Design a protein around this ligand. Structure first.
Ligand SMILES: [Zn+2]
Ligand SMILES: [Zn+2]
Lengths: 373, 373
């Protein structure tokens, strides 16, 4: 396999289906990436993650750099070997979590210094250091380090952060390219910024395309703006990105958000929703989400979802999973997470198949009618 | 298969190896039973419990009667179907946990009333109700309901509780026999009491043998007396029980306790040690236990144990499991528990094979020399 090859096999409107080939494996798109926080997709062995259909997982650089440490992971043979996942891994840059989770952050044009939320230890991230950490982890898809823009943002602040992010995107590109082993075996994605403003989104797309990346993320969405606004921004933002490269919507999302984002040209997704909310009792079904802790499920012998092909739905009842979650049992988290990740992968498979067959518009309509009934 | 058939295939000294055949499966003895608290062996799917080699698991009646409830489990098809384990299950009587976990307990010759530790709800257990609950769960091996004796106990109190336990053993026998479906498909074990006193242990054995049971537990040990005293009591107590029926040492134990108990004629064991201590960071190895949280393991690429055949030791390092446990990750509990239960099953297999080959005495000596090096 090549370092990186994205091929589009079929299209319907703005939606696309295809494959990313990388040295460690093939990624089917549109793709959903389960999130590995600290070298584990929570409550699942990697073989179970694979059995649900995932082709690639996400690793959180911020968490990994704090525990167990990036240099330590490298000394132990890299993240893949350490955690037991041998297929592609996309790593985020660490920048978002620094701002959401860490303390005493000091921002500058050079990068950010911050105190760990676990022990108050002091740390630094910059374009160069983030790329280096992702190299030490052995990431297959490396995210450029940027400066996130809160929502809402004034035009001036959105412009300043987008402009800084574009300068940092060039620094990220040069850092990645100056490390031969990384440049030859991994891929680098740039991140479009600009908040909700079309002109800033266009300037950001133009800057990123001039630098040149293997893929392009739409950053700065799913930060409180709501689905209508997110879709409005995607409507104009995705067409600005190079058509022939993957489009990655970071931190999205709920099933309907995924369907609508694919309708707008997005190829890749990640979110903690299926794992995190699974441990909290929310199970996804084709008839909408349910909270398994509700007393109405205490004697319900049906599986979580009536059609789902996952091992949890083949073997256990809602009543059992209800009991486990109410009791705080680890097995409850395991089963809910496996089902939710499997549900997400089945959603992506239905999306891919419907695009390939030219019936994605109908699929989206049928999906919504039933999910929101 | 028959309802119950225990056959001894080989002996060495007081040690025995053989099989219990029951409708749901064959149990190889000496046997270790992983403990299912509230319809789950914590952090393991039932298929993983089976893959480690377990032939039978224990269910805690006290926990199950409180959550999800015995009548509810029966309405949902029984414990086996509910939890996804189709092989034999031994259920305890609930009496021990009532005394260790519940509140406002009121004891009498009829039984015990108590308040749930979860919500203060009021409940009753008696010989008759305990046997009925174990029937509602669909237990394969039912434990007679007894009155536990604390350690230390005066001779008078030990005698009074043993005598009550023997009256309750007859009530348990009659309750079990008066339920045709239970009598025809499950087995009933009686529990020897008498604290550390030989004369009371003998009276208890005589009373139990006169009633007649499918197996005989040695109760009231592993309650703070220490290994030397436990072994001293086993020395005289096990020979008092019928030779041709299984001997079950409840709530034992550490690997060396198991080896010495087998040397004294015990055929069956259960304990939370491998599961509970696994979640706390203790891993069993042939060179003794280790605490994986210790900083010395942070960069140790070796498996938990150098010889263990379990899937955890085939795939992951001490360094990874160290990280998971330190981080509080669910996968850490999953992997530690799978390894510890697998280790226990490999111990039982080595015990069975060595007895079958007439080299158990040598095995015990070699095991101790290395485990306590
Ligand atoms: Zn499912
Ligand atoms: Zn192992």
């Amino acid at each position: 396999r090549p370092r990186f090859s994205f091929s589009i096999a079929a299209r319907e409107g703005k939606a696309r289906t295809g494959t990313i080939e990388m040295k460690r494996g093939v990624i089917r798109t549109p793709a959903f990436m389960p999130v590995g926080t600290a070298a584990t997709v929570k409550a699942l062995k990697p073989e179970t993650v694979r059995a649900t259909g995932a082709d690639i997982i996400l690793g959180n650089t911020y968490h990994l750099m704090l525990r167990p440490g990036a240099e330590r992971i490298a000394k132990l043979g890299g993240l893949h070997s350490f955690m037991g996942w041998d297929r592609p891994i996309l790593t985020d840059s660490g920048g978002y979590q620094v701002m959401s989770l860490s303390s005493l952050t000091k921002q500058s044009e050079e990068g950010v210094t911050f105190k760990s939320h676990l022990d108050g230890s002091r740390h630094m991230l910059s374009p160069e250091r983030s790329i280096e950490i992702q190299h030490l982890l052995g990431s297959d898809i490396v995210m450029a380090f940027d400066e996130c823009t809160p929502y809402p943002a004034t035009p001036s602040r959105a412009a300043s952060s987008m402009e800084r992010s574009m300068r940092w995107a060039k620094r990220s590109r040069d850092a990645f390219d100056s490390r031969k082993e990384q440049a030859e075996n991994a891929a680098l994605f740039g991140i479009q910024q600009g908040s909700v403003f079309e002109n800033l989104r266009q300037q950001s797309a133009d800057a990123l395309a001039e630098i040149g990346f293997d893929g392009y993320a739409v950053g700065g969405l799913a930060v409180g703006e709501g689905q209508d606004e997110m879709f409005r921004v995607l409507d104009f933002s995705v067409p600005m990105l190079p058509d022939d490269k993957p489009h990655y919507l970071m931190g999205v999302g709920k099933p309907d958000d995924i369907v609508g984002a694919v309708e707008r040209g997005i190829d890749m997704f990640d979110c903690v929703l299926p794992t995190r909310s699974g441990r909290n009792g929310q199970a996804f079904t084709w008839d909408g989400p349910i909270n398994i802790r509700n007393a109405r499920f205490s004697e319900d012998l049906k599986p979580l979802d009536s059609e789902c092909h996952c091992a949890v739905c083949q073997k256990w009842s809602r009543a059992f999973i209800h009991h486990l979650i109410r009791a705080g049992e680890i097995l409850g988290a395991m089963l809910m997470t496996e089902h939710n990740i499997a549900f997400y992968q089945q959603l992506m498979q239905k999306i891919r198949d419907s695009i390939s067959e030219g019936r994605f518009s109908q699929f989206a309509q049928d999906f919504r009618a039933r999910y929101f009934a």
